[PDB]
Structure 1
Amino acid sequence: LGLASANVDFAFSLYKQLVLKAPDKNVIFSPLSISTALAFLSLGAHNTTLTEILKGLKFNLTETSEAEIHQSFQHLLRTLNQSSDELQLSMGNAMFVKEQLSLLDRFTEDAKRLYGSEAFATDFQDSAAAKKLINDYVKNGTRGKITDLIKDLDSQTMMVLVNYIFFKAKWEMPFDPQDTHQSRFYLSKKKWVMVPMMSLHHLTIPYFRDEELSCTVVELKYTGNASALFILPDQDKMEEVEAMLLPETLKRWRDSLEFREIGELYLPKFSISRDYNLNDILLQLGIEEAFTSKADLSGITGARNLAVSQVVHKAVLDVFEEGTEASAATAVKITLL
């Protein structure tokens, strides 16, 4: 729907930034996870601290109220939080609160009905323990993937808002591990490399090749309401293509895609992990005040004493012959002003 195009919009801006940082490196993150956690945080924000996040997320307040937006998130978590037979989807939200603190009811309830958040009283006093506790909830929810989410813990940390997402799915037309073999993978215009290339032959898959952008779009579906769209820009087109990553250029890919028999398809078999500290990225996206001493998070307790310290994000992605596993977590470090 409309507010789904916001989420897409927020994904591409976040990507555009993460690349400005280290273009040369691979990328991997879940946009949905990030958007849910800052929408969750937003549940506790007020005034400008609120406008900002709700605008850093790419929402059009001119046409949407804060209740409609929060609702969007509940319906969505409701709809997708369900593992089919051949496709596992899991989404979780929890709030780790230090024992001393009593949080407003409106907040604890809204957390429950709206985002399905689980509470946990914590002793952020003894960092060592509080830490492990959060890490278990994440690794537990990600079936052993995100294992080092929180690595350090401020003894001043009054609260932490977490979100995890897990995806396990199979290919509709899986590769033959017997046919998997080494091949050249071009890092650059001349610097090649040997890599395990997974190959398939004579498949009829949703393809598309648009020249106005100089790239090729192929679609491989998973046995489930989920599919992977691989975009292959030509040599020296990557920049141009990332320039055009817009909710609309995506809308196009998915329309123009027409089934076709492909003689040969080659896809590397990869496994990648990435840690992220999102403070600077958020700042660039305009989510500023929440990080400042002018933090207005009164929605949580009932006074302007809380502020955000850090928003980190870990993701892992394995792409093998039989299918795909993917997973990520977002945690918001909330410190007392």
Structure 2
Amino acid sequence: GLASANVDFAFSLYKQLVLKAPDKNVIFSPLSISTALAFLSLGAHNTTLTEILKGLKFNLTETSEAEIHQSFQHLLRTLNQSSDELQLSMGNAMFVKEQLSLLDRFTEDAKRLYGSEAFATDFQDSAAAKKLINDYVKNGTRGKITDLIKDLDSQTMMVLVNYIFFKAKWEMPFDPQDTHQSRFYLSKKKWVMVPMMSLHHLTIPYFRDEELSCTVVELKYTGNASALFILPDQDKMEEVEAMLLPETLKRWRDSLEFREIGELYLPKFSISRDYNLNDILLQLGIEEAFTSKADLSGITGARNLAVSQVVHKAVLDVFEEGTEASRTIVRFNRPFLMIIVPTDTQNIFFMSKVTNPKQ
């Protein structure tokens, strides 16, 4: 039951995202936000837990928070059990005010279960706090993510960091020698020169949704996951988004039949954006933790801590051979959706809306 609520929360979060930016490129990992939100819940008490679990569509009458955690930890264990062919590295964490002593029990629990590590942070002289947090996030990853935090206010109380990066190879890798410079149409008469990679004489899961006015194709990775590319027709993206629901995603996944597509064209883009989730989570349904009344007793036990900044950066690469590259015609020269899901179960690893691959 965790996966369905994960997908619902993902869709609500994406809807809020587009509401804050109708045409800008959208990229975020629902899995990363899910683990960050659950880990924040790990340190909550009283009605803050109830609100943070009203978020992500959780029926507390049937599902208890301990079992939610255990399912999350099992998900992380399975993800880390994967071999080198596909890897998804997640490193979200929490930076606590150093003037308040952090709970040793909470740090041990986070390290053992959610694997996140927290420490006292010298938030005094926030200019140096920016430097130290950027240095930590750069040392954590291999170098995929830098300048994650744009700014820090004076006497910022605590900050939540969430980063993520995929690394997987296509089942049908694109040919770099066939990557052609073409046009991507922003609108009816607006286009940008962007490189697109091409395939031919290949069969993939494909579905033309005649009652939804879109086209869904599935590109499988060498691992147990895959990606779904969603191409609405001209001036029909908003209608697709409006009727875009998990009940739509289930029908799309169960209506994926193999088709011998003639040529497939896909923009060569590497989206990377940072997102501050204060207002967006406030509109989502989690609001008490942000107004100096979080009752975050699992963090220190003093109810002195509340969330001030939640910054998430989802970096994901779409090249010829996947990340860090060395009849029926499908051309993605229009703004399109992209949802990364497993074949076994429905759970959104990554979700993106691409409107300008030059950006």
* C-alpha distance after superposition, 1:48-87 (max 9, x if no partner): 2221111122222222111111112111111113452222
8 Å CA contact retained: 2:102, 2:119: no
Shift of 1:174: 1.3
Q: Give the direction of change, closer, same or farther, for the CA distance of 1:325–1:166 in structure 2 (3 Å limit).
A: farther
Unaligned runs of 5+ in 2: 327-351
Q: Give the direction of change, closer, same or farther, for the CA distance of 1:220–1:274 in structure 2 (3 Å limit).
A: same
**Any idea what SS the aligned residue of 1:194 has?**
strand
**Any idea what SS the aligned residue of 1:154 has?**
coil
Report which stretch shifted further, 64-73 or 310-319. 310-319
Q: Give the direction of change, closer, same or farther, for the CA distance of 1:92–1:256 in structure 2 (3 Å limit).
A: same
Unaligned runs of 5+ in 1: none
Q: Give the direction of change, closer, same or farther, for the CA distance of 1:81–1:134 in structure 2 (3 Å limit).
A: farther
* C-alpha distance after superposition, 1:161-185 (max 9, x if no partner): 4333221111111111111112232
Residue of structure 1 equivalent to 2:224: 225
8 Å CA contact retained: 1:308, 1:333: no
Report which stretch shifted further, 142-151 or 166-175. 142-151
Residue of structure 2 equivalent to 1:177: 176
Report which stretch shifted further, 106-115 or 259-268. 106-115
8 Å CA contact retained: 1:46, 1:299: yes
Q: Give the distance between the partners of 1:92 and 1:184, measured in 2 at CA.
A: 36
Q: Give the direction of change, closer, same or farther, for the CA distance of 1:73–1:326 in structure 2 (3 Å limit).
A: farther
Q: Give the distance between the partners of 1:187 and 1:162, measured in 2 at CA.
A: 32
8 Å CA contact retained: 2:96, 2:118: yes
Report which stretch shifted further, 165-174 or 187-196. 187-196
Q: Give the direction of change, closer, same or farther, for the CA distance of 1:239–1:303 in structure 2 (3 Å limit).
A: same
8 Å CA contact retained: 1:202, 1:263: yes
**Any idea what SS the aligned residue of 1:68 has?**
helix
8 Å CA contact retained: 2:124, 2:155: yes
Aligned-residue CA RMSD in angstroms? 4.0
8 Å CA contact retained: 1:167, 1:326: no
8 Å CA contact retained: 2:166, 2:317: no
8 Å CA contact retained: 2:36, 2:93: no
Q: Give the distance between the partners of 2:281 and 2:117, measured in 1 at CA.
A: 25
Shift of 1:334: 32
8 Å CA contact retained: 2:111, 2:117: yes
8 Å CA contact retained: 1:168, 1:326: no
* C-alpha distance after superposition, 1:273-293 (max 9, x if no partner): 222221111111111111113
Report which stretch shifted further, 227-236 or 131-140. 131-140
Shift of 1:300: 1.4
Shift of 1:262: 0.8
**Any idea what SS the aligned residue of 1:23 has?**
coil
Shift of 1:236: 2.1
Q: Give the direction of change, closer, same or farther, for the CA distance of 1:216–1:72 in structure 2 (3 Å limit).
A: same
TM-score for both structures, normalised by structure 2: 0.84
Q: Give the direction of change, closer, same or farther, for the CA distance of 1:301–1:116 in structure 2 (3 Å limit).
A: same
Report which stretch shifted further, 150-159 or 43-52. 150-159
Q: Identity of paired residues, percent?
A: 99
8 Å CA contact retained: 2:163, 2:314: no
8 Å CA contact retained: 1:43, 1:110: no
Residue of structure 1 equivalent to 2:242: 243
TM-score for both structures, normalised by structure 1: 0.89
Shift of 1:231: 0.8
Q: Give the distance between the partners of 2:105 and 2:139, measured in 1 at CA.
A: 29
Q: Give the distance between the partners of 1:255 and 1:326, measured in 2 at CA.
A: 31
Q: Give the distance between the partners of 1:123 and 1:105, measured in 2 at CA.
A: 18
Pairs within 5 Å for 1:53-132:
53-82=52-81, 84-132=83-131
* C-alpha distance after superposition, 1:240-269 (max 9, x if no partner): 111122222111211111112111111111
Q: Give the direction of change, closer, same or farther, for the CA distance of 1:101–1:309 in structure 2 (3 Å limit).
A: same
Report which stretch shifted further, 183-192 or 167-176. 183-192
Q: Give the distance between the partners of 2:314 and 2:226, measured in 1 at CA.
A: 18
**Any idea what SS the aligned residue of 1:196 has?**
strand
8 Å CA contact retained: 2:165, 2:316: no
* C-alpha distance after superposition, 1:202-253 (max 9, x if no partner): 1011112221211111111111112111011111221111112222211121
Q: Give the direction of change, closer, same or farther, for the CA distance of 1:158–1:190 in structure 2 (3 Å limit).
A: closer
